[PDB]
Design a protein around this nucleic acid. Structure first.
Lengths: 72, 63, 69, 41, 139, 136, 175, 55, 183, 114, 60, 89
RNA sequence: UGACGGAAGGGCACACCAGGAGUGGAGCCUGCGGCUUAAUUUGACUCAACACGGGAAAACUUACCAAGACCGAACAGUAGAAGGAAUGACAGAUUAAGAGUUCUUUCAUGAUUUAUUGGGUAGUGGUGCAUGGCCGUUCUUAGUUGGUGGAGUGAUUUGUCAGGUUAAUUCCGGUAACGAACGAGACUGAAACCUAUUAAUUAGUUUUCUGCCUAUAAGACAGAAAACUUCUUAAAGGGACACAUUUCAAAAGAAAAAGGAAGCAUUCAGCAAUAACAGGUCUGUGAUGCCCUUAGACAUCUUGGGCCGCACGCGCGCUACAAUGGAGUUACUAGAGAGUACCGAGAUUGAAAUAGUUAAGGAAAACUCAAAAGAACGUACAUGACAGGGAUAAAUGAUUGGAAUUAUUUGUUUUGAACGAGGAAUUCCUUGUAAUAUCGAGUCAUUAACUCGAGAUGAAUACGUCCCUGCCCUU
């Protein structure tokens, strides 16, 4: 079997991994979701961009809101 | 506005109700243009029959 | 690399009360500061422990104006 | 401008300069060493 | 020091030359085509097919399941025919697919369900020919 | 050896190699030049001047008779030729003649592309506000 | 230097990294050190290293060091041909010779520091090679090679020698 | 009829067939990750969604 | 009869069975933002003051998609000013009353910014500050709670921004803090 | 008997395996004398089984240098600095992050006034 | 034909913009302290060269 | 006619290879009925032999530029003979 | 009190110096002005307008133009009216139009609404000199303030300073000031390390079995299996604070050197005060005030065109002017991205190429997804607008789309232009940085010479001063 947990908060999946624990918590590489946008609503002004990013942590094990768990 | 007779009661029979503001497409439930639903019951809010809160290009009707 | 008054005053306040606990070794002072003053950041703890040790060299050699232990 | 002819330290450049021959022919004489330069003595 | 186990122990360029003359019917488009679309001149080498056939065959020796496309990007160049900055493009398919088809006729290569692989005797002749160039290299 | 040859009433240079001396013909470029060398079976590396007029009468024949000399149709500068015939036959000073009459054919019927040739403007529809600014 | 290969001027020996320490002598002039992070740190770079990095200029040759390492290797062999001496030994005489010992600054005549003497010695020899080999039959390595050997003893036809004499003369009248 | 030709033009390719979720304007869209939220509207609600101005 | 063929479905992207992980959380975040702003317009008279997926709807949710710290809550506090401002109360007294409510409710510091046409036809903006408040740092990403509201008057729209600095209960501590204990 | 060691450059990683043998060095299966950029052969040479899986082509030449240098120490310690310090310590320098308003890390686009 | 001069200490840096260093030199031949202006990166331990030593460079 | 389009340009036979649109077939159907000038907005027709004798006006942007079809004005687009701008002064 | 000084004193910034790359000169892509047209929509015009409105416009977007239609006239009252208010319509004519728009014609459905007065409503219409919000700027440097106290009738001032030091009103110090708050710092993300911990798949290594191949004796490859964690991924910890030596300044600190993965706050970023502009946006918004238009519409929709129009001027860029190169063949090497019913597209096969017919796996460390600059190979090219340059054009071949003409993009042949390193001026830059060549993503039915990111080769010149442009303190 395979228990997979993916969440936006690192302390979330880490807390639930240790609570379920048993095969070790494997850590699939983190995904970053980068979005770059112009700050201004119109064109006027200096060319300024702001950098947004949301992370996604994935843990898979084999035997709170924002955390999802699936059993294969 | 001019609407089919079998159509107007279908909205009223169904009536909460929601409808997109995009007029190009049809309503997924009744299979009728979103225009007819909008204009038929935009007139119903003036009679104080419902509430016409608008949010994210969708109109939510709740009296 | 000067030190702000939030770490010079914090370093002073520890020494007046807790002189004997501290010593000339920098690495011991790191361990004490985590226990004798609740600092939530490792970097801030080292800077205070850095200055607290630095004050000992002057204190050991003689009296200093700011600190009266 | 030079019209250095086409038919009939050692480098194909110098043996093309004062021999007044094109550097393509200068390869032929030196034959009768690397794919970047031909240095002979 | 040095020893021989496979084709990785001989320099790539002089093995393909060594495996060139050893090699395959010549089609009618041998002298009328280039090896891609980015290029603009047909190969200057009269026997460019054989020097290409050895390289394509050698690439099979190292990649277990290899296809036409993986060769097309391998024998590909840059496209800078305008003022736009050059962007890499695929090589030619028919020249490489035909040559790979010809190696099937000899039996050097085979057909796996996800590409092509060298046969048993294809390993032999490749290993055999890679040896004299190895011996010649040491001397 | 001659520094000045003549083929299809067009003067070439004898210093260049045979494929890069046949580009002096108006209808022949670089890819076409190499092909006729292979069809005629001459040595590319040998210079044009050294090459005997025995081969000249065939190269000019090949340049004017390529269709029956095993030349792919997609190699021809004039495919689906109008005015009868469906072959290039444009390796001559005939390059200008066909080009000149194609515009006049367009210009006769007042085609828009033809009209853009009359005014001497950009023909293939490109921005002309800032580029192509030859003063007049 | 390539498995094949003294400073008279007492003012450059300490700033010339040739053989005072073992970290200088190297089979290739391709060392990836950080020689430009502190003042007076480039003096740790081998002399052949410094010359190679000046063969990597004029925009379209930016970053091509293996390209510039090949031409220098072929140049040194030709240098040994023309002088029957060590190309490294031959080059370091050129730096001593092709170094302007005075300069004019707004004018006003002032001397030139020894470290600036080395920088300008390679910079002047570098430009002559670039100009001579541009749109010319001679291969870049050859053009660099005879430039150095000419600049070695006294030859005026060398570009660096021409420039040194011009600037030295200007400073002389600028006093 | 009165509406037979109304909105009879097919818009399936999309530059006037895609709309921002809330603003509804057709310029400046962000179709990445299926957001369908154009700029000047995603910036306001970015923190609510979960995106943060990290580096 | 109409010549329309398109159909914009009244579905949601959080109910999709086959969805990528990158697409899953983006849709989860977007749906929360859409839902949060939906009932904010409904529960304005009640102070919805937050949603998780207030200070006699479900049918709307299916059709469309197929607090003791009242002082510390910025959303409900901001609505208090909007209600009072629209009631004709002067901005100085009404905002002053709300600030005293927060200050005695256990907040380290708060600030209300009112900008608009308060004085006359020419625009003006007043800022009220009470208590300690840091403006720069990553700390304000955890020690802040703000809401942006706009009220409509007879001469225009007035913008009211209410922000409140929280305390240690949102677990953590500020940057500069030594608080040396004694023996 | 064997030890494991590795060396790093900008992004080049060369994981070596120092082990008893007849002295044959091989990188990814090819002999050390048949390195692709033949100019760099003498720089690499300033029973091992090295595997290079990163960087470019000059980065891996320096990474291989570390792998051979580090392997001798690791093998000898368990069972260089006066010449080149970077033989045993990785160069910390990495590519900087591009920022908006410029084509590089510090370069900025041209300005106009009139 | 030229006479060398060791560098003792740096007086500072002058010449409008900072690109000319005022240094004090002691000629090893005649242990004479001579003040000059230097163009370029210099250090105390450096040894200069001089083709002329009669210009007591002071800038008034 | 399906045979003639083969010897035309690559674009011409492709735009004919796709199924005939209703507007174009409803256009040539009028072309057979009429010759009397016929106006149209359709600047997308390919000149085919079935309309050689027709006199047709093409909406440029505001008017109708009457053009009489010539056998020498083949598969080029029908919209190339109605300019959409006064050229230059 | 502030502002200003062709006033002084002290500091700072690629501001300049020492330089690199340049732009300006040529062709082309793009924006702006101008002229033209029916329209060539419009905002912005010193830094703080001009590859900017994420603005790469065939249709839509779309705001402009020529036509055509059209209500998106609620609600309330009247008239009319199931013996019909009205709506839709095949055929002919009209119309580009298969808009029944209208007319000849009768056939369907039925108060869903026609004419009516008020009245709202609608608008990419105006007004950013009526506003909110957002953003830029002053201003990326170090500045700002109130509680009590001292001085002045008062605006106000001290606190917020002599000196030194610092990246920093950061500190040592000084003191009618004392005690504070914001700003800096502190803080967050990435990079620079862990042979110690935790783990092992979809990462990797090792070992073993089976088959095959060559050597002189080691190994290679393929198909399996089941172990370890150096690499890889990534959680918690640890790890540098200039501690510590020498010198310099009883003090804050400064400068080598050694050690270290890491020593300019270690580097790059993020957040970033008080006060202010009547700086940009009502053309992002169902956020909005007032005015304007409101059945012959400035609302809406359809068709066609335009934003691409060229006598010239300016800004951002790409390609070039070659031998440190171009053309042909060979081996190669990454990083960060993206992916559904349909998206990213493997393998087979048709051919000269773009591309076509079938077609696995993959909601992904699993499948697709793949490097060129540079390198090596030849008795190739030899300095000549040459094979440098690839504009301009002529033929033809395919894709996307309802549609490719005013070329969407692209293939084959042919065509072979200016351009011989660029005047006054002017921009960016201090270390894995500049530069060079390339890859991914945004936009995306189809379209990058743009922008946002990613690696790959890796320079030169400084360790300084206010001379220019400018800041910030003090008389």
């Amino acid at each position: 079997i395979t228990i997979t947990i993916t969440s936006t908060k690192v302390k979330a999946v880490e807390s639930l991994c240790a609570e379920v624990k048993v095969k070790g918590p494997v850590r699939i590489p983190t995904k970053t979701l980068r979005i770059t946008t112009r700050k201004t609503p119109c064109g006027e002004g200096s060319k300024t961009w702001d950098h947004y990013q949301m992370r996604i942590y994935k843990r898979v094990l084999s035997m709170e809101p924002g955390v999802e768990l699936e059993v294969a | 506005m001019r609407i089919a007779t079998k159509d107007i009661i279908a909205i009223y029979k169904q009536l909460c109700i929601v409808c997109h503001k995009d007029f190009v497409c049809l309503h997924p439930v009744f299979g009728i243009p979103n225009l007819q639903v909008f204009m038929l019951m935009k007139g119903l809010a003036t009679k104080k029959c419902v509430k016409e809160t608008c949010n994210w290009r969708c109109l939510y009707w709740t009296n | 690399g000067v030190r702000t008054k939030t770490v010079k005053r914090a370093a002073r306040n520890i020494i007046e009360k807790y002189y004997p606990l501290l010593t000339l070794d920098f690495h011991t002072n790191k361990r004490v500061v985590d226990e004798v003053a609740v600092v939530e950041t490792k970097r801030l703890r080292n800077k205070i422990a850095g200055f607290i040790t630095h004050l000992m060299r002057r204190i050991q050699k003689g009296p200093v104006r700011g600190i009266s232990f | 401008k030079l019209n250095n002819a086409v038919l009939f330290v050692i480098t194909p450049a110098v043996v093309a300069d004062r021999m007044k021959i094109t550097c393509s022919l200068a390869k032929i004489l030196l034959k009768d060493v690397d794919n970047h330069i031909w240095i002979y003595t | 020091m040095h020893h021989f186990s496979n084709i990785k122990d001989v320099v790539a360029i002089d093995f393909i030359k060594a495996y060139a003359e050893h090699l395959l019917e010549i089609p009618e488009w041998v002298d009328t085509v280039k090896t891609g679309m980015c290029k603009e001149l047909a190969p200057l080498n009269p026997d460019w097919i054989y020097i290409r056939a050895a390289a394509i065959a050698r690439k099979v020796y190292l990649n277990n399941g290899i296809g036409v496309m993986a060769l097309r990007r391998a024998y590909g160049d840059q496209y800078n025919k305008h003022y736009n900055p050059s962007h890499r493009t695929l090589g030619s398919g028919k020249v490489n697919r035909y040559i790979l088809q010809q190696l099937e006729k000899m039996g050097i290569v085979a057909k796996i369900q996800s590409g092509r692989s060298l046969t048993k005797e294809g390993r032999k002749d490749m290993d055999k020919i890679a040896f004299q160039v190895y011996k010649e290299h040491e001397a | 050896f001659q520094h000045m040859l003549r083929v299809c009433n067009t003067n070439l240079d004898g210093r260049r190699k045979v494929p890069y001396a046949l580009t002096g013909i108006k209808g022949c470029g670089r890819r076409y030049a190499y092909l006729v060398c292979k069809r005629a079976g001459i040595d590319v590396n040998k210079r044009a001047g050294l090459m005997t007029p025995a081969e000249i009468e065939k190269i000019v024949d090949i340049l004017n008779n390529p269709l029956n000399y095993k030349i792919p149709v997609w190699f021809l500068n004039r495919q689906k030729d109008n005015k009868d015939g469906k072959d290039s036959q444009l390796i001559a000073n005939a390059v200008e003649t066909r080009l000149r009459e194609d515009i006049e054919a367009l210009k006769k019927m007042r085609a828009h592309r033809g009209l853009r040739h009359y005014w001497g403007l950009r023909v293939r529809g490109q921005h002309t506000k800032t580029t192509g600014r030859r003063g007049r | 230097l390539f498995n094949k290969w003294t400073v008279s001027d007492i003012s450059l020996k300490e700033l010339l990294a040739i053989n005072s320490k073992l970290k200088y002598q190297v089979f290739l002039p391709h060392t990836a050190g950080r020689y430009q992070i502190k003042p007076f740190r480039k003096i740790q770079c081998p002399i052949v290293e410094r010359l190679v990095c000046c063969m990597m200029q004029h925009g379209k040759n930016s970053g091509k060091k293996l390209l510039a390492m090949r031409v220098v290797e072929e140049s040194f062999e030709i240098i040994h041909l023309l002088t029957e001496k060590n190309p490294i030994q031959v080059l370091v005489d050129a730096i001593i010779n092709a170094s302007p010992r005075e300069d004019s600054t707004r004018r006003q005549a002032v001397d030139v520091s020894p470290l600036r003497r080395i920088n300008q010695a390679l910079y002047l020899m570098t430009m002559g090679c670039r100009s001579a080999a541009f749109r010319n039959s001679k291969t870049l390595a050859e053009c660099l090679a005879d430039e150095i050997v000419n600049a070695s003893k006294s030859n005026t036809a060398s570009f660096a020698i021409k420039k040194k004499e011009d600037m030295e003369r200007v400073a002389k009248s600028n006093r | 009829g009165s509406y037979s030709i109304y909105n009879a033009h097919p818009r399936n390719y999309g530059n006037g067939s895609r709309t921002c979720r809330k603003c509804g304007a057709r310029k400046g869209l962000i179709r990445k990750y299926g957001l369908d939220l154009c700029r000047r509207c995603f910036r306001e609600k970015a923190v609510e969604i979960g995106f943060q101005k990290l580096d | 009869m109409f010549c329309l063929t398109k159909t914009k479905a009244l579905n949601v992207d959080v109910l999709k069975t086959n969805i990528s992980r990158k697409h899953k959380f983006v849709a989860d975040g977007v749906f929360y933002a859409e839902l949060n702003e939906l009932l904010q317009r409904e529960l304005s008279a009640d102070g919805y003051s937050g949603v998780e997926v207030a200070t006699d709807l479900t049918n709307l949710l299916i059709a469309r998609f197929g607090v003791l710290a009242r002082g510390l809550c910025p959303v409900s506090q901001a609505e208090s000013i909007k209600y009072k401002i629209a009631e004709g109360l002067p901005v100085r007294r009404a905002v002053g009353s709300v600030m005293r409510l927060i200050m005695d409710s256990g907040a380290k510091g708060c600030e209300v910014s009112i900008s608009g046409k308060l004085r006359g036809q020419r625009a003006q903006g007043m800022v009220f500050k009470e208590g300690y408040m840091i403006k720069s740092g990553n700390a304000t990403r955890q020690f802040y709670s703000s809401a942006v509201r706009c009220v409509l008057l007879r001469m225009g729209i007035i913008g009211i921004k209410v922000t409140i600095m929280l305390d240690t209960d949102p677990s953590g501590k500020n940057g500069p803090a030594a608080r040396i204990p004694d023996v | 008997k064997s030890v494991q060691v590795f060396g790093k450059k900008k992004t080049a990683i060369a994981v070596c395996l120092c082990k008893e043998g007849k002295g044959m060095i091989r990188v990814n299966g090819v002999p050390l004398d048949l390195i692709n950029p033949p100019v760099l052969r003498i720089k690499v040479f300033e029973d091992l089984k090295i595997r290079v899986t990163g960087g470019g082509q000059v980065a891996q030449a320096y990474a291989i240098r570390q792998a051979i240098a580090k392997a001798l120490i690791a093998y000898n310690q368990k069972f260089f600095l006066e010449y080149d310090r970077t033989l045993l310590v990785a160069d910390p320098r990495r590519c900087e992050a591009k920022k908006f308003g410029g084509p590089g890390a510090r370069a900025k686009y041209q300005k106009s006034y009139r | 034909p030229v006479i060398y001069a060791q560098v003792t200490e740096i007086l500072g840096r002058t010449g409008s913009r900072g690109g000319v260093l005022q240094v004090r030199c002691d000629i090893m031949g005649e242990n004479r302290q001579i003040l000059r202006n230097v163009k370029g990166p210099i250090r105390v331990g450096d040894i200069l060269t001089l083709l002329e030593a009669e210009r007591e460079a002071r800038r008034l | 006619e399906a045979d003639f389009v083969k010897m035309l340009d690559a674009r011409a036979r492709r735009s004919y290879r796709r199924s005939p649109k209703l507007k174009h077939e409803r256009l040539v159907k009028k072309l057979l009925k009429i010759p009397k000038l016929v106006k149209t907005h359709c600047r997308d027709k390919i000149i085919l032999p079935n309309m050689i004798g027709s006199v047709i006006g093409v909406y440029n942007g505001k008017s109708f530029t009457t053009v009489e079809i010539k056998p020498e004005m083949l598969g080029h687009y029908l919209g190339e003979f109605s300019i959409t701008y006064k050229p230059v002064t």
